[PDB]
Design a protein around this ligand. Structure first.
Ligand SMILES: CC(=O)N[C@@H]1[C@@H](O)[C@H](O)[C@@H](CO)O[C@H]1O
Lengths: 402, 151
């Protein structure tokens, strides 16, 4: 029953962890029940990640669930490659094929490239943050030559917070040199709200400007401050609140007490936390399929010191990989299915534009069909005031007497 | 007075290791010396670098000369940054202020940003590989808007 797993959670991720415990209750059965070992660490420091991963490998876990930053992702991936320990995470996908990793986050690259091709953009800005890797940036730069775009790529990530008001105003005066009106905010939701706060201050949110929020959590941030500005805003949504399964989860989620489960009394859930809840369901059904297939997975003895030289890989970790990558269930992220590399496949991402009446589902793409949604004939406000420009020159346009 | 040192060298790098051996003989003095432990490894595997760093730390070296890739660099920086071990490298610099690291290679990007200015280039082609990295590519793109370049 007690199947041991390793848990690595950042120190600022409250809702992301509280989503893990709710998954532990919803998916626990009488056949068996997972026994997590949790340690809160600074995810950026890779030595602590190395120390914590070895702190789990010694205790004899069968799988590990955690996170990584740009600095620490290499530590996880290579340790899990030689030790055959399976790793499930909601953090960004690796920049290539890495085994013994189960990346719950879907590949956003195919969404953004297509979304730009829908709007027929041939010149746009792209403010990226290295915190989530430059895999998305390498794609737009690669596709810049095929479709003859002219990208204005600015590493907005490396900035300090005490000179933040001076440099952000200094940034848009550089974006003003080309008269740029098409920006892509490839940042995490926190930096987005920091950018959006400065966009209103200088006043670049009026009729004409068009932004893209290039992350899976469009509705997760605060969007009411540029909703009435007039500038069109796009984004991506993976946590579909239209579906019934989520509507059931939100009912139970909306009621819970916020003292025991921090960050849970709201009506929405972050795409990080939502994937955590679904990550439990993958680890559940994986060991469940290990029972039905009659496979022995318990450790023969002590795992030992992780720095084992020569390197010792336990053979029964392979079947845990093969069982994890055969899971095909339904959750908050639509269909959840994994390829031989652990990348999400068969998935569905919604495209949301911000209008006057709040968020609105307008499009969706798939790894086999792009930009399909036809059509959003329902809803619809039917309101528009066209802007006509002219010049005061007689007799075409003259001011009246009174 | 035999001082012990951690030596981290990749496999395909032979002349680099040659130069290290030459430097020791040229600078070794009569009253103290450098006693290196040389772990030849593949620099890309983060576990290997971790495994090799601890083999040097347990042997009790006083400083470590080595290299790093795009992947393994963060393994070195945090490991030395917490253990206070000194690391000396000719690999490309750290994108930031990481202590206990001695970067022998100087900052090339500032020079390239200036040379492009001298030739008065306004549109050009930039070729790069993701293996070495992209910090210079981040730099040319950082000043492509500021200086009106069509990269
Ligand atoms: C070919 C295939 O497997 N299609 C499935 C579809 O049947 C299912 O309704 C949906 C759930 O979101 O996920 C898709 O991947």
């Amino acid at each position: 029953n007690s199947i041991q797993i390793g848990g690595l959670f950042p120190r600022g991720a409250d809702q992301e962890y509280s989503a893990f415990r709710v998954g532990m209750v919803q998916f626990s059965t009488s056949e068996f029940r997972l026994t997590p070992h949790i340690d809160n660490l600074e995810v950026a420091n890779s030595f602590a990640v190395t120390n914590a991963f070895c702190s789990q490998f010694s205790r004899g876990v069968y799988a590990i669930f955690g996170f990584y930053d740009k600095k620490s992702v290499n530590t996880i991936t290579s340790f899990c490659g030689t030790l055959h320990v399976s790793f499930i995470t909601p953090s960004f996908p690796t920049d290539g094929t890495h085994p013994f990793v189960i990346q719950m986050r879907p590949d956003l690259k195919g969404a953004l490239l297509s979304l730009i091709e829908y709007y027929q953009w041939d010149k746009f800005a792209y403010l990226y943050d290295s915190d989530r890797g430059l895999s998305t940036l390498q794609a737009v730069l690669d596709s810049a030559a095929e479709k003859k775009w002219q990208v204005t790529a600015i590493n907005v990530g490396n900035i300090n917070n005490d000179k933040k008001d001076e440099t952000y105003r200094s940034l848009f005066q550089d974006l003003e040199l080309k008269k740029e009106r098409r920006v892509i905010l490839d940042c995490e939701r926190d930096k987005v709200n920091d950018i959006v706060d400065q966009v209103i201050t200088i006043g670049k949110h009026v009729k004409g400007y068009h932004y893209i929020i290039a992350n899976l959590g469009f509705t997760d941030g605060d969007l009411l401050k540029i909703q009435f500005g007039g500038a069109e805003v796009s984004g991506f949504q993976i946590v579909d609140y239209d579906d019934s399964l989520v509507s059931k989860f939100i009912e139970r989620w909306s009621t819970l007490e916020e003292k025991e489960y921090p960050g849970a009394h709201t009506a929405t859930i972050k795409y990080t936390s939502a994937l955590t809840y679904d990550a439990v369901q993958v680890m559940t059904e994986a060991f469940r399929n290990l029972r039905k297939q009659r496979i022995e997975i318990s450790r023969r003895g002590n795992a030992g010191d992780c720095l084992a030289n020569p390197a010792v890989p336990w053979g029964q970790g392979v079947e845990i990989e093969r069982a994890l990558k055969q899971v095909q269930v339904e959750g908050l992220s639509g269909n959840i299915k994994f390829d031989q590399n652990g990348k999400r496949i068969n998935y569905t991402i919604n495209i949301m534009e911000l209008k006057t009446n709040g968020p609105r589902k307008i499009g969706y793409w798939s790894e086999v069909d792009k930009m399909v949604l036809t059509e959003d004939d329902t809803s619809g406000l039917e309101q528009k005031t066209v802007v006509v420009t002219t010049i005061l020159e007689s007799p075409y346009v003259m001011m009246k007497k009174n």
